[PDB]
Each structure stands twice: as structure tokens, then as C-alpha cells.
């Protein structure tokens, strides 16, 4: 292969810009789940209760 040439300075600069633009994680997910529950049931559950519930169900 190469690595030095595969990731040349111009490519590496574009790569870092794309890494800062496109995240690895879905931001605002717990708020979206809390909103969906509210619209569907009419009941209020917070982003924090949603986050805590995801952790309990994953363990």
C-alpha cells in the first residue's frame, strides 16, 4: 500500500474538515424520543428520563 501517499496533506486537510462537519453520533436523539412520546401519548417524559431509560435497557 502506502499510507503517506493515500493520506496526502491536501486529502488529510479535507478529511479533518469532513470529520468536524459530519458527526459519528446522532445529536438530539433523546430529545427526539421525548418529543415522539409526547406527540403520540400526550405524556411528558424528559430527555434525561429517556437517556436514563436507554442506559437501564442497554444494561
Query: What secondary structure does DSSP assign to the chain, as a single string?
Result: --STTTT-HHHHHHHHHHHHHS-SS-TTHHHHHHHHHHHHHS----HHHHHHHHHHHH-
Range of the domain at 56: 1-59
Rg (CA), the chain: 20
Technique used to solve these coordinates:
X-ray
CA 8 to chain centre: 28
Structural resolution in Å: 2.1
Domain tally, the chain: 1
Amino acid at each position: 500500500n502506502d499510507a503517506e501517499g493515500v493520506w496526502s496533506p491536501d486529502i488529510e486537510q479535507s478529511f479533518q474538515e469532513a470529520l468536524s462537519i459530519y458527526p459519528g453520533k446522532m445529536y438530539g436523539r433523546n430529545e427526539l424520543i421525548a418529543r415522539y412520546i409526547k406527540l403520540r401519548t400526550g405524556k411528558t417524559r424528559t430527555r434525561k428520563q429517556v437517556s436514563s431509560h436507554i442506559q437501564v435497557l442497554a444494561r
